[PDB]
Design a protein around this ligand. Structure first.
Ligand SMILES: *[C@H](O)[C@H](C[C@@H]1CCNC1=O)NC(=O)[C@H](CC(C)C)NC(=O)OCc1ccccc1
Ligand SMILES: *[C@H](O)[C@H](C[C@@H]1CCNC1=O)NC(=O)[C@H](CC(C)C)NC(=O)OCc1ccccc1
Lengths: 305, 305
């Protein structure tokens, strides 16, 4: 037993990380087949970053202005193009460690592992949720751009995130691997609003299920509720509305525990209305919303890769 | 910026995990050079587990009774021995993916990454502290035994933990890679006490430093304290006594923030005495003690491997 925020094993992704240098600036890129993907702001200088004209800046660059290194292995760039906010550098050598992979644009509320990298070298790995407002709460320093987020299913790595920037609130923003930002963000050094961030209701319920499965059953009450009744309380506490689709997704966990979803909603409503009374749930004194239902089942059936 | 519980990249360790089967029982082993290390209870049946006579059980086993598989790669066992609570199986083939490595017996309060595995296949990775009472708060299901804990320094993997058992409290126990248990535990299915678990004071202070570095400065007060004064309060809240060695270890963080350690102790004392007032620090409504000073500096200078 036990329940922990658990990242995917990172080895398949470690093998794809490279260093990309364009003049002064170094950041990380992702080497898959004979293409290296990295944030297009690798081409910017200090002055450019307030409002870069990326098309103009990239025109001043040729293939030989991009230095790509995989460890000591120097790669040779034989073509470059910009797709949205990412550069694709065609290289002479196919990555021999390329995993089976897909590019996916993830939904808000879904989770993924981040391999934080500097200078093309892995630093560490952690789980993140794509927040409803299309930010993540990460840990990234200068040089971390081009670090990626991913999920693994069996043998297939689904890349969903590449890191580009930090917002004034200290939260993080980035793109999919086609270079489209999640949320309203643009890659320039301006103040940008993320807007209200709501709690992922279905994930909180998943985690309450996890907690019950792990012996914590004190928060359970003799009450039930309705979707409408609960959703009035959800809106009050800036929680996402719960839908029948959400109820359906929780079905496995509800069946495993024999606790009906609306009964867990009634539990959740009491927690929201009355706080925790200085008590804790799975080691936390707050309601946790970065575990999906899938996350909970995976960590209870022992799914491997 | 941002501060997250961050595991080491697991790829070097992924390459060493194998499946070990002895009759019915399967668990994980660690394949380094031409030796596979695994928990000795792989040789037990259901009946044996209350009080196994390991010496007698192992005598009934030969080399060919151990089936070791690395993926599909079958390995051939050419010798076996028991060292404390671990079996060492000599195999015909040296692991070609063996990292540079050391075996280390870790100190209480130090942290490490756990690669949770089932059937010799990696499931996920998370950070753990060795608690003062020599338990860890992990996430392990049936079949997880032989999963290992490690640290990485530059290119060298220091293995410090192998998983063996779960205690009645839901916490976890295991050995170093020489098979000696951390704490008073024995590998039999009996009720075993871990005893009082104290909070790792130096780690809480490290994390308060992390919090200040990341903008959270509300908990700071105009007060100071003395080591003796603080330690009277530490003992009251089941915190470890703070020593000058601890103060010395926090020196880098104190200098970086310009906050004196005893001033942070005064902050910590107020938090202990007056709770948090429903406020939060680096996303937590509790005092966090599983980040070492090293952990904090690593995640602020962007150390890579
Ligand atoms: C790319 O490595 C870098 C990652 C930032 C740096 C600090 N924490 C992060 O996530 N991204 C940028 O520097 C980005 C470049 C623009 C052209 C998009 N600008 C940015 O994120 O500004 C915010 C910032 C906050 C704190 C320090 C530096 C920059
Ligand atoms: C080895 O894979 C297993 C790991 C336990 C299983 C559940 N959570 C864990 O950490 N270790 C044992 O089964 C161990 C074997 C003895 C001979 C040492 N016994 C044990 O840990 O008993 C506690 C237990 C709790 C919950 C389910 C099963 C066993």
């Amino acid at each position: 037993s036990g329940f922990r925020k658990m990242a995917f094993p990172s080895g398949k992704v470690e093998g794809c990380m490279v260093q990309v240098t364009c003049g002064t600036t170094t950041l990380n890129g992702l080497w898959l087949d004979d293409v290296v993907y990295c944030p297009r702001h690798v081409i910017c200088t200090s002055e450019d970053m307030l409002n870069p004209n990326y098309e103009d800046l990239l025109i001043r660059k040729s293939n030989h202005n991009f230095l790509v290194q995989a460890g000591n292995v120097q790669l040779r760039v034989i073509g470059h193009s910009m797709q949205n906010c990412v550069l694709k550098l065609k290289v002479d050598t196919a990555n021999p460690k390329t995993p089976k992979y897909k590019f996916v644009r993830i939904q808000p509320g879904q989770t993924f592992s981040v391999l934080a990298c500097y200078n093309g070298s892995p630093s560490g790995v952690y789980q993140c949720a794509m927040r409803p407002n299309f930010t993540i709460k990460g840990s990234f320093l200068n040089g971390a751009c081009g670090s990626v987020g991913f999920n693994i299913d069996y043998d297939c790595v689904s890349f969903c995130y590449m890191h580009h920037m930090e917002l004034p609130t200290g939260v993080h923003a980035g793109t999919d691997l086609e270079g489209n930002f999640y949320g309203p963000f643009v890659d320039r050094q301006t103040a940008q609003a993320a807007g209200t961030d709501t709690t992922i209701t279905v994930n909180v319920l998943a985690w309450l299920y996890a907690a019950v499965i792990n012996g914590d059953r004190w928060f359970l009450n003799r009450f039930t509720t309705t979707l409408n009744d609960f959703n009035l309380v959800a809106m009050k506490y800036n929680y996402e509305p719960l839908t029948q689709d959400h109820v359906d997704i929780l079905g496995p966990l509800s069946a495993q525990t024999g606790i009906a979803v609306l009964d867990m909603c009634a539990s959740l409503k009491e927690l929201l209305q009355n706080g925790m009374n200085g008590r804790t749930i799975l080691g936390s004194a707050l309601l946790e919303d970065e575990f999906t239902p899938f996350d909970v089942v995976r960590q209870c059936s022992g799914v491997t890769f």
